[PDB]
Curated annotation (Swiss-Prot):
Monomeric heme protein which primary function is to store oxygen and facilitate its diffusion within muscle tissues. Reversibly binds oxygen through a pentacoordinated heme iron and enables its timely and efficient release as needed during periods of heightened demand. Depending on the oxidative conditions of tissues and cells, and in addition to its ability to bind oxygen, it also has a nitrite reductase activity whereby it regulates the production of bioactive nitric oxide. Residues 1-147 form the Globin domain. The gene is MB. Its EC number is 1.7.-.-, 1.11.1.-. PROSITE patterns: GLOBIN. It comes from the Eukaryota. This is Myoglobin. It catalyses: Fe(III)-heme b-[protein] + nitric oxide + H2O = Fe(II)-heme b-[protein] + nitrite + 2 H(+); H2O2 + AH2 = A + 2 H2O. InterPro entries: Globin, Globin-like_sf, Myoglobin. Its main location: cytoplasm. Heme b binds at H93. GO terms for cellular component: extracellular exosome; sarcoplasm. Nitrite binds at H64.
Amino acid sequence: VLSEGEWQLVLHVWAKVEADVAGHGQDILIRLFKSHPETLEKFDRFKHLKTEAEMKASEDLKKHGVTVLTALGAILKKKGHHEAELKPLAQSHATKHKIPIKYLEFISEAIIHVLHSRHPGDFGADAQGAMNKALELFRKDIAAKYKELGYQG
Ligand code: HEM
């Protein structure tokens, strides 16, 4: 579990992400796509984008970045009591989108990378550690749902 103090660190940086959800969403997905190109293959909707400039110009990509960060934010704000929000997400990702747990680890790394770039002052080592723990709790809870359904990873 995270402590109250670690949750505070997480939500404090998150409040900053909220100031520009679209810009953060975009940078996160692009980082994911460039670092792990196999991830882009899971999106029929974005597969035609070849360059970072084409990605940056895509308004639909920016819209999806907002969707992703919006769902993540609702999870974080529950501070671990996220069963209702997590359940539907795990089911679509496992059964409909077919996203391995490892890709969830890759997007976690992209979030951390971006947060680092845009929020140095609010994103020191202590905050980075808390954010990591929160994202691991998220992945651990999702992984359990996947296991139940027969997709473990
Ligand atoms: C931070 C972790 C993630 C969050 C919170 C998240 C959230 C969402 C949401 C809220 C949706 C739309 C509703 C739905 O279908 O459930 C969605 C759709 C989808 N997600 Fe995720 N997602 C995450 C990770 C990923 C990653 C790692 C991938 C691929 C590598 C993935 C691929 C998909 C695809 C393929 C769709 C359908 C997009 C479309 O065509 O409309 N997601 N995601």
